[PDB]
Amino acid sequence: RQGASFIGILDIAGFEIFDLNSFEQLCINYTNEKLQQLFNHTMFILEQE
Amino acid sequence: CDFSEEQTAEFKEAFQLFDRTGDGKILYSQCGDVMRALGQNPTNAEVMKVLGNPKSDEMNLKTLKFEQFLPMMQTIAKNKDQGCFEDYVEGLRVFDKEGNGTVMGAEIRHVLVTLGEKMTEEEVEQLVAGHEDSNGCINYEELVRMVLSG
Amino acid sequence: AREKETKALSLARALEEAMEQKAELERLNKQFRTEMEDLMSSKDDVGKSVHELEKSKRALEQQVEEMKTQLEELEDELQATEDAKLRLEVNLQAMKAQFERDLQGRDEQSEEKKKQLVRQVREMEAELEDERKQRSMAVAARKKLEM
Amino acid sequence: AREKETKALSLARALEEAMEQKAELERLNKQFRTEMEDLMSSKDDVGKSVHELEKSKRALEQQVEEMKTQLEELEDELQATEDAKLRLEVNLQAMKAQFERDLQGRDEQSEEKKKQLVRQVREMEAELEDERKQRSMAVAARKKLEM
Amino acid sequence: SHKSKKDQGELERQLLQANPILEAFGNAKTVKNDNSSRFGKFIRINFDVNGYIVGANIETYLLEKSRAIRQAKEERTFHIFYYLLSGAGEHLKTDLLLEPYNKYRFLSNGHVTIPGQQDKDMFQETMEAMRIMGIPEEEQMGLLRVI
Amino acid sequence: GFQACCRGYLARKAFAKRQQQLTAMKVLQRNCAAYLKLRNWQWWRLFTK
Amino acid sequence: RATSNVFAMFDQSQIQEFKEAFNMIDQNRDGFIDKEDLHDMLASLGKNPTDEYLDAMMNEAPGPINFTMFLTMFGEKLNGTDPEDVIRNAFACFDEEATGTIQEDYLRELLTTMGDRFTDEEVDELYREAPIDKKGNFNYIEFTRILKHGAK
Ligand SMILES: [Mg+2]
Ligand SMILES: [Mg+2]
Numbered sequence: 062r063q064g065a066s067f068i069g070i071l072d073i074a075g076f077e078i079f080d081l082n083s084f085e086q087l088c089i090n091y092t093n094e095k096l097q098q099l100f101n102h103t104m105f106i107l108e109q110e
Numbered sequence: 111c112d113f114s115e116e117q118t119a120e121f122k123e124a125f126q127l128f129d130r131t132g133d134g135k136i137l138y139s140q141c142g143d144v145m146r147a148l149g150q151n152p153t154n155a156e157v158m159k160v161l162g163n164p165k166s167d168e169m170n171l172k173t174l175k176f177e178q179f180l181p182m183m184q185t186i187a188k189n190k191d192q193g194c195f196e197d198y199v200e201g202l203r204v205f206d207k208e209g210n211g212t213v214m215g216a217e218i219r220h221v222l223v224t225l226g227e228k229m230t231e232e233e234v235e236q237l238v239a240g241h242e243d244s245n246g247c248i249n250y251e252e253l254v255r256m257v258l259s260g
Numbered sequence: 261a262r263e264k265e266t267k268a269l270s271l272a273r274a275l276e277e278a279m280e281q282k283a284e285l286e287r288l289n290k291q292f293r294t295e296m297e298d299l300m301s302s303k304d305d306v307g308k309s310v311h312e313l314e315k316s317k318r319a320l321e322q323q324v325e326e327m328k329t330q331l332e333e334l335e336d337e338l339q340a341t342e343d344a345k346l347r348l349e350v351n352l353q354a355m356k357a358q359f360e361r362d363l364q365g366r367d368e369q370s371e372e373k374k375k376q377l378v379r380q381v382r383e384m385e386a387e388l389e390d391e392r393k394q395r396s397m398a399v400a401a402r403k404k405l406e407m
Numbered sequence: 408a409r410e411k412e413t414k415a416l417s418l419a420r421a422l423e424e425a426m427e428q429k430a431e432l433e434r435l436n437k438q439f440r441t442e443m444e445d446l447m448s449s450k451d452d453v454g455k456s457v458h459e460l461e462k463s464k465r466a467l468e469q470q471v472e473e474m475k476t477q478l479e480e481l482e483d484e485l486q487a488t489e490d491a492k493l494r495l496e497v498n499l500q501a502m503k504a505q506f507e508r509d510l511q512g513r514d515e516q517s518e519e520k521k522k523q524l525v526r527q528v529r530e531m532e533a534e535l536e537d538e539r540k541q542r543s544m545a546v547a548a549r550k551k552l553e554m
Numbered sequence: 555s556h557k558s559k560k561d562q563g564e565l566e567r568q569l570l571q572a573n574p575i576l577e578a579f580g581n582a583k584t585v586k587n588d589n590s591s592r593f594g595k596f597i598r599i600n601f602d603v604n605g606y607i608v609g610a611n612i613e614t615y616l617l618e619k620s621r622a623i624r625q626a627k628e629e630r631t632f633h634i635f636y637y638l639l640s641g642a643g644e645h646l647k648t649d650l651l652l653e654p655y656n657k658y659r660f661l662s663n664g665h666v667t668i669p670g671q672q673d674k675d676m677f678q679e680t681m682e683a684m685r686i687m688g689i690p691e692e693e694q695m696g697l698l699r700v701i
Numbered sequence: 702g703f704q705a706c707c708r709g710y711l712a713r714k715a716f717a718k719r720q721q722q723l724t725a726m727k728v729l730q731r732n733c734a735a736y737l738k739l740r741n742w743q744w745w746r747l748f749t750k
Numbered sequence: 751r752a753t754s755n756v757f758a759m760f761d762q763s764q765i766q767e768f769k770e771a772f773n774m775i776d777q778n779r780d781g782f783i784d785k786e787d788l789h790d791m792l793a794s795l796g797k798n799p800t801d802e803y804l805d806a807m808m809n810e811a812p813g814p815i816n817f818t819m820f821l822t823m824f825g826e827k828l829n830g831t832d833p834e835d836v837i838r839n840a841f842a843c844f845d846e847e848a849t850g851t852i853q854e855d856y857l858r859e860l861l862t863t864m865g866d867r868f869t870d871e872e873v874d875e876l877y878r879e880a881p882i883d884k885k886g887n888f889n890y891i892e893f894t895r896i897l898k899h900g901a902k
Contacts, residue, residue, distance in 0.1 A: 063382060064600030064608050065246070073594035073615065079585070079626065085592075085618045092594065092616065111265060124716075127723060130863055147716035151705040177269055181262035191702070198703045216605045226704045235557040237707050246603025254703075260710035261408035268415040271422050278425035285432030292439035295465055299446040302461045303453050314460040320467050327474035334481035336754040338488050343752075343759075345492040350728055350832060352499045354839035355506060356721060361842060362510035366517035373521040381528030388535040391542035398542070402549035723864055725843045730866050732837060735830045736897065737872065742827060743804050747788075748771060749899040750795055 071096075113184055121183070124148055125176060135173040138164055145183060152186045154227050160185055195258045202250035212247040555606050564688075569599070569610050571683040576612070578637060578680045582621055583630040588668045592618035592632075623660060630666050633676070638701055641677025650698055751826060756818065759825040768824060772817045783815040834894050841890050851887035 073096060074089045125144055131137060136144060142157045158164065160182050205213045205221065215238050222234045229237075241248040241256075302310070450458045505512075555563050576595065584590035598611040625631050642652050655665040667673070684694055739745055757765060773779065777787045785805050792799060811819050844860070845852055854877075861868040880896055883889075895901070 062609055063602065065603045067598050067600045070597045070599065071594075072591070072597075074591060077586075077590075081626070083620070085616065085620060088616050111269060127716075127720065143712050143716075146709040146712035151709040153702075153705045177266040178262075180269070181265045184265075185262065192705060193702050198706070201703065222704065222707070229704065229707070231556045232558045232560065233708070233711055236711060239557075242604075244603075257706045257710050260706075260713050261411040264408065264411045264415050268411065268418050271415060271418040275418060275422040275425055278422055278429055282425055282429035282432060285429060285436055289432050289436050289439055291469075292436070292443050296439070296443055296446055298461070298465055299443075299450045302458055303450055305461075307457065310457045310461055313464055317460065317464055317467055320471055324467065324470050324474050327471075327478060330478055331474070331481060332753065334478060334485050336752070338481065338485045339752045340754060340758060341485070341488045341492045345488070345495055347832070348492060348495050348499055349724075350836055350840070352495070352502050353721065353724060353728070354836040355499075355502065357725070357839040357842045359502075359506065359510055361848070363513065366510070366513040370517055370520045370524075374524055377521070377524045377528055381524075381531050384532045384535040388539045391539050395538075395542045395545040398545040398549045402545075402552045405549065405552040722843055725840045726860060727865050728832060728836070728840050730861060730868060731830045732832060732897075733861075733868075733876065734866070735827065737875065739827050739831075740899075743801075743807065744823075745827075746899055746902070747792065747795070748775070 111180065111184060112188075113180070118180075121148055121180075122176065125179065131173065135175055136179060137173050138169040141174065141179070141182075144179070145186060148183065150183070150186050150190065151192050152190070156186065156191070195254050199251055199254045202254070206250070211249055211251055212245070213250050215241075215246055215248045218248060218250075218253075565607060565609075568687050569607070571686050572610070572612065574683045575680060575687065576614075578633050578676065580614075580617070580632065582618075582625075582632050583666070583668060585626070585628055588671075592621055625662055627663065628666075629663060630668075631661065633673075634680075634701060635661070636665070636673045637677040637680060638698060640673030641675075641681075646698070649695075650701075756821045756825060760821070760828075765821070768821055769817075772820055781817055783820065834898070837897075838891070838894055841894075850891040851889050853886050854882070854888050855886075857888055 073092050076093050077086050077089045079086065124147065125136070126134070128136065128140070128144065131140075138161065141161065142152070142154075145152055145157065152160075202213060202218075203209075205217050219234050219238060222229050222237070223231065237257075238248060241253060447462070450461075555565075577589070577591065580593045581589050581591050594615040596613045596615065598613070599607060600609045600611075602608050621631050622635070630636065638650075639652060639655060642650065646652070655661055681694065760768060775787070775791060776783070777790055785808065788804065789800070792801065792804075808814065811823060815823070842848060858870070858873045861873055862870070880893075
């Protein structure tokens with residue numbers, strides 16, 4: 062139960078598209094967009110900063 | 111042979127401890143174990159050179175005697191490429207970040223497994239064992255001092 | 261040179277063995293000289309000296325037999341010391357066996373004591389240590405309120 | 408390599424000389440053995456009633472000297488064995504000091520490690536407890552910003 | 555925990571088998587793929603100062619619980635529903651009171667098989683994984699009864 | 702150059718463990734050797750009682 | 751054999767135990783062991799058996815067995831053996847983890863790959879009159895007592 066560091070492996074639900082979406086699909090798309098935004102941030106904005 | 115009989119008797123007695131070889135012989139792969147136990151610190155390249163550059167399959171289909179093992183140890187003792195501990199203690203300092211005479215054990219294990227002649231995971235663990243601390247670091251100076259006394 | 265060196269070792273051992281045989285043969289040959297000289301001198305002996313020497317043979321024979329006592333006594337001390345040496349050598353070996361375990365026992369006690377001592381202190385290093393992240397997060401959280 | 412070959416080849420010359428030199432003793436011993444039997448057989452014919460004791464005298468003299476060599480050799484082995492056991496006994500006694508200095512000696516060291524843990528847990532808890540107080544100030548700052 | 559006594563520790567086997575169970579209990583077949591993970595996880599694999607694994611903490615985010623109630627055409631619900639209905643035997647069917655696929659109204663698509671997959675074997679695989687992880691038989695029976 | 706000392710230290714340490722282990726096996730097989738003929742001794746089993 | 755002082759062979763406790771046993775195993779204590787006393791002791795110990803084959807061993811020793819001859823014949827056969835503490839200490843060398851049990855195949859391999867090579871028959875003979883668990887595990891901690899025949 063003790064550790065100096067960790068490696069958090071993420072595996073959220075990818076972009077889901079169906080003929081009839083609902084709240085679950087909306088949340089999945091929101092999470093995917095948040096992940097993509099964080100990736101673009103850490104890639105471009107943090108480097109320039 | 112330029113070797114006194116006093117130490118030669120002890121060398122023969124130590125070589126006769128293996129036994130498990132059919133008779134007064136010695137295998138090619140086990141030659142390094144007996145060459146490093148009596149003394150000296152020969153390397154894998156040096157062992158392969160003194161042995162006449164044996165083939166890959168020759169290390170398990172032939173056996174030598176003591177008359178051929180004595181000159182091997184003689185040449186290893188006379189001709190060698192080792193060095194004192196002053197250069198070893200100074201070499202491990204390249205990995206020291208803060209420079210307080212300490213280095214992470216994981217870095218040393220990685221350097222020993224990859225860099226150099228490579229070493230199995232069973233040997234590096236026994237080598238780094240005993241020097242465990244709270245910060246997981248192993249003082250290279252104490253490690254070299256303990257290895258020199260071995 | 262290494263291959264030819266083995267021939268010198270074999271020749272050296274043969275030379276030493278051959279030289280040893282020469283010394284042994286020299287003593288045997290020299291013994292025959294003294295033995296042969298005694299035979300020729302014994303024939304021309306006065307006669308009475310032969311009987312006189314026999315009286316000393318029984319006394320000398322007892323010395324040889326008496327030497328067996330010292331030889332047995334010397335062998336007894338050698339066997340007694342050797343027999344006792346085995347128990348002494350096994351004593352250090354037995355102590356060495358416990359010495360290796362006693363050394364690990366001290367580490368086990370420290371590891372066993374730390375399993376409970378460090379465990380109790382580790383608890384303070386969990387909820388309290390988490391406060392550091394909460395404290396740092398509090399500054400970040402407070403920064404949001406400050407913003 | 409040529410030096411080793413010359414030394415090895417030169418060593419064969421010494422072995423050949425030893426064999427040739429020792430060969431003379433072999434042939435000389437055989438010739439002396441034949442002459443010894445002739446002198447011994449001829450001596451008994453002249454007077455075996457008295458010369459018989461002389462034959463045992465020569466054997467007794469060599470046997471007496473052999474007993475002395477055996478006793479002397481046993482002494483060298485007895486004193487060596489008696490002294491060898493002293494080294495092992497001294498080693499056991501010397502190792503006994505390490506038994507109380509390493510094993511038993513680790514008591515003050517092992518207890519120190521355990522005692523240091525009890526002192527480190529208190530120091531760690533002190534820093535953790537003291538650090539926890541900072542969380543109250545940090546939480547108070549966040550709570551103060553809320554007000 | 556690689557060392558001289560190298561062996562597949564229980565922690566590694568648990569970390570390896572914790573993924574199938576979660577998949578079987580969460581994943582569901584969709585029109586885009588047969589193994590559509592309907593939940594996002596976050597495996598927090600901890601590491602000590604030496605780098606050896608010591609624990610793992612998974613955290614699920616957004617669980618599509620509405621899939622078990624109703625699904626779409628040419629799709630399936632959680633794979634556990636089919637695994638239990640298939641691998642269940644006579645005793646298990648009588649205990650859990652299972653029924654054919656056409657009886658349950660939640661399964662709109664009925665019994666739909668995945669190309670290159672047998673529920674009868676996947677159920678046994680999931681049971682073996684649960685047993686290896688460290689879940690007793692009572693907990694598995696309770697889970698099956700709840701399902 | 703340093704790996705040689707590490708490799709030799711293991712061979713020397715392992716050799717020392719085999720030296721003391723070899724002597725320990727001697728007392729084991731020696732104690733069992735005499736035990737064989739001693740096991741079938743009519744005077745031993747009777748005296749042990 | 752190595753003739754020497756019979757008292758210097760056995761330890762103080764060992765010679766004391768031997769003397770106490772010799773003083774007990776004797777219906778008519780007088781420093782002279784005969785076949786009648788041994789037969790009576792066997793009859794009392796085994797519920798009145800009669801083994802006339804034991805009388806064929808008196809010829810080995812010069813006449814009847816005396817306390818001196820008894821100690822001599824004990825020492826001539828007990829040579830090489832050592833106390834139980836040293837035996838356990840030597841056994842502790844292997845295993846390392848100190849589980850108290852070792853595999854039988856491992857013991858057989860150890861007894862035939864170093865020092866005096868013991869034949870397979872000699873190793874198997876050590877299990878024709880003792881228990882053993884179906885899962886192997888040579889209980890050495892418990893076998894140390896059976897080695898001295900402290901049962902039955
Ligand atoms: Mg997925
Ligand atoms: Mg009586």
